[PDB]
Amino acid sequence: MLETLKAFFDFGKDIKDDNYSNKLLDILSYLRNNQLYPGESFAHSIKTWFESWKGQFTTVRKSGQCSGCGKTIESIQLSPEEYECLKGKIMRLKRFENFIKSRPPFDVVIDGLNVAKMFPKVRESQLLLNVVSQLAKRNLRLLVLGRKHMLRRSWSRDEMEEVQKQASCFFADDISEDDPFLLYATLHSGNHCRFITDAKTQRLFFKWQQGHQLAIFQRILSYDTVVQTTGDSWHIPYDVPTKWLCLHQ
Numbered sequence: 001m002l003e004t005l006k007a008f009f010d011f012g013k014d015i016k017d018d019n020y021s022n023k024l025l026d027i028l029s030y031l032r033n034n035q036l037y038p039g040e041s042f043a044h045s046i047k048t049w050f051e052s053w054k055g056q057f058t059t060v061r062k063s064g065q066c067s068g069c070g071k072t073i074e075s076i077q078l079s080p081e082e083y084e085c086l087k088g089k090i091m092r093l094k095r096f097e098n099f100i101k102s103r104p105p106f107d108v109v110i111d112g113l114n115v116a117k118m119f120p121k122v123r124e125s126q127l128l129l130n131v132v133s134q135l136a137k138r139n140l141r142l143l144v145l146g147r148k149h150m151l152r153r154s155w156s157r158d159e160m161e162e163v164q165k166q167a168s169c170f171f172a173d174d175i176s177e178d179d180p181f182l183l184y185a186t187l188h189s190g191n192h193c194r195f196i197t198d199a200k201t202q203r204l205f206f207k208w209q210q211g212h213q214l215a216i217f218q219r220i221l222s223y224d225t226v227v228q229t230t231g232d233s234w235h236i237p238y239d240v241p242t243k244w245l246c247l248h249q
């Protein structure tokens, strides 16, 4: 589909209807609101179309600070109001709710089932413990969302006991869905908590996810990797990617 969209940018160089241009800008806004990134050849067409504006293919510093503008890429951290927005509408089972509310916030919410079943070679009671042990080395509060299945041999427990002594474990019924509990416990704990597993808010969810998801651990950046603009500038990631199209005018 990106292939088709690119072709309309190419047509844009000669089509100087400024009503046509604002439909091309709508595409850019669609990319932003849905965490999509153009291909490299699509990026070239965007740069080229805008220049009919100065474009440069660049990278982003550790506190980017784009190498091209010197401008600072949008922050990945949610504002207190933005976070209280996204939080409210995700919660929009009471044993779990109780479990959370009678306890201090957590730092990492771990989807035990999906984490354990991702490196299929090793036993999954072992894999969970390994993830927990590496994280408990820094004294974080850990909530492991598990199932009654984990406390039934054989998921050697044994090994689950070592898990429960370094992480807090809530064992939901085996039929329960994973996503609701993880989203609740993480968002309830606060903007600081991370996890392992409308248009403005769907964007917020995407910003929140990118800045709070621990990927097996991958580093979380200071800045937000999305198509973005300030009016005088556009910053478009392409080909999360690390290459950026820099536009300023």
Ligand SMILES: [Cl-]
Binding pocket: 001, 002
């Ligand atoms: Cl697509």
Ligand SMILES: [Zn+2]
Binding pocket: 066, 067, 068, 069, 070, 071, 235, 246, 247
């Ligand atoms: Zn730049």
